[PDB]
Amino acid sequence: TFTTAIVPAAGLGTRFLPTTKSVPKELLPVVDTPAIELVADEARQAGAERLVIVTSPAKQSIAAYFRPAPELERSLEEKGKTGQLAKIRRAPELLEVEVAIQEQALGLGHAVACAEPNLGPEDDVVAVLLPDDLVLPHGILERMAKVRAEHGGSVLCAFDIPKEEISAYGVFDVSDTDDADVKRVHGMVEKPPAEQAPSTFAAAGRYLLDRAIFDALRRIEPGAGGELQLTDAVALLIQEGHPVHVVVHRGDRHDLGNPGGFLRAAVDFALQDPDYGPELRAWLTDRIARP
Amino acid sequence: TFTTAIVPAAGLGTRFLPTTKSVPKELLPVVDTPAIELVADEARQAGAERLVIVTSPAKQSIAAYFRPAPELERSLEEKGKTGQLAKIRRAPELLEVEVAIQEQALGLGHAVACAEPNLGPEDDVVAVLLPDDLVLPHGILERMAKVRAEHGGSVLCAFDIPKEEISAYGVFDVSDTDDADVKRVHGMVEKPPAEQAPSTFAAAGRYLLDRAIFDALRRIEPGAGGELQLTDAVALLIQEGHPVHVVVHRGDRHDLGNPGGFLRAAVDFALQDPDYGPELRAWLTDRIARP
Ligand SMILES: O=c1ccn([C@@H]2O[C@H](COP(=O)(O)OP(=O)(O)O)[C@@H](O)[C@H]2O)c(=O)[nH]1
């Protein structure tokens, strides 16, 4: 049981210039649907009632997407576009949405800290979903919530990636529990060489964090500019005997962080859509047989 | 010889809801570059010195895209990201851009009519580029200008589409000239059944229009709700003996009007981009051979 999910959405998306000069990265469509909607939908399916979106001053339009649009709805109703009407009603009815402002892009720990004013006394634990990761099928947070129910404390997420390929990620130092997909976390190493990787478990952008994380984020050594390393806040909770576990995702994943990975997501989803799939698959079938 | 290009961009992209509730269709990226920049570049490559973008009040932001971004530019300089800096300076430096408002989306003829106040004393001919078409590899307007230099009057654009796939388009009733890719236009049929199509030449969204089109757009019978169609204006000029020719494009084209056509564009470009091609091709080889 968490009721509040936090989405850190305050980057620029340099890798998507020049589009992200004018469009927030999180509003970019996967086929026809903004990435932020796909992440809100995952959060709702795992039981979120509220979504706190952390954004920069210039990207406040992310949240405006989740507000009703009576005029557009009326216009669409008047033209009998009932299918398109349902699509625009979906995000505003998923859950309650609020914005927290991160004044400057000081990193992920700082972003999470910026959400604390939006929490209530009922928020003993909060979900955190990074919008550049899609984790499929939906439900990693449900597996994580079961871990929290049995062990208390905080829960993280990993992908299983061979050591030869993991050096770009944070890698957990782990030991076994009674469940093979659930590991006790002793720590994390940033970007180990293959030979020094403590495991094949690479950190993924899903979190179920005890409310104690906020106090840990205030107690850690800030960075040069005021960057608060979420990883250091987790290490502090560990040192103070807070239970931290990880669930290993065994499904598919997509990385919306660069245009290449984004395009893979979009093709993957379009090919399953009966409106787009057949005609795109036939086109692709010929396109890739030629230069 | 034209210096002004008009881009009608005032539709809602219904086919891209729910994204187009918040993001103008014409700012959506093809790999990482907004559609509108690709169209602007085609215009500039045909010798346009000015872009008049016709848009709705809701979609004026398509304007800011073409403005300098000082703080963003300085940030990239400071980080030494010379290649990304060039990406964001490309659009503002392509050509002069201005905006004309279409208050309500009453059709393409009405949209073109909205750009008339932006014309100066030398705009005897104007280019029109529909932003949902890409004409590859090198556009077509330079070829159209040559036709206008030979014959006077106005020039249209067609794709060569088999009769059994042509029924979604306007189809020209034509006769031959000396040049196999230039036809004399006698008329245009809307959405003929295959067996009735007067040719395989489907109307494409490029035009080189004599200034006389604005008077034709004033004299044609408005629609049920005030919809002027460019079609009726062209037919009226033809009736009055205005010469109308069409150039048949034989190269490639993309349709950015729907999510399917848009992804085909993105995959086409990414496969030719060395940053994505080889790996994307293999990904695609596997992906299309499974549901
Ligand atoms: O809510 C957030 C999300 C990210 N970031 C930071 O902003 C950058 C993320 O940029 P993004 O994820 O948009 O990717 P880019 O394309 O800019 O590299 C990194 O420095 C993150 O630490 C942040 O401060 N707040």
Ligand SMILES: O=c1ccn([C@@H]2O[C@H](COP(=O)(O)OP(=O)(O)O)[C@@H](O)[C@H]2O)c(=O)[nH]1
């Ligand atoms: O500048 C323009 C461009 C289009 N339209 C009209 O708007 C509709 C098309 O909208 P759009 O091209 O965005 O496509 P959609 O996704 O809505 O079908 C057609 O009736 C066009 O004639 C318009 O009034 N002004």
Ligand code: NA
């Ligand atoms: Na560019």
